[PDB]
């Protein structure tokens, strides 16, 4: 999914943290592969020095969703860009909205 500008398919978690931290800007975000769950992705956003990371998975039928807390309705999205657009809006259940894309 190279068409996702914010997707960095060759970086590690550590590399992901350094890129975000380098922005010095809360709300900066990227997507990377998980280094713990093969085949899963990680949506990473900077807040007060820490990188809040949401595992993102594709369904057996093609749609996308983010790890969701217990007792909360999970949302699915046809396109990854759609999931990303949703979480750029205020009050969607992540620590701060996705605000500044850190692009390839």
């Amino acid at each position: 999914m190279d068409a996702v500008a914010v997707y960095h398919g060759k970086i590690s978690r550590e590399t992901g943290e350094k890129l975000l931290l380098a922005t010095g800007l809360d709300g900066s975000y990227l997507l990377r592969d998980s280094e713990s769950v093969p085949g899963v992705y990680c949506l990473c956003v900077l807040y007060h020095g820490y990188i809040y990371t949401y595992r993102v998975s594709q369904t057996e039928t093609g749609s996308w969703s983010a790890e969701t807390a217990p007792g909360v309705h999970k949302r699915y999205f046809r396109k990854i860009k759609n999931l990303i657009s949703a979480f750029q809006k205020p009050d969607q259940g992540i620590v701060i909205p996705l605000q500044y894309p850190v692009e390839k």
Binding site: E17, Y50, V72, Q92
Partner: peptide, 10 residues
Amino acid sequence: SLTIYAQVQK
């Protein structure tokens, strides 16, 4: 560790 694995809360 600077990475925190969080979950969508809404």
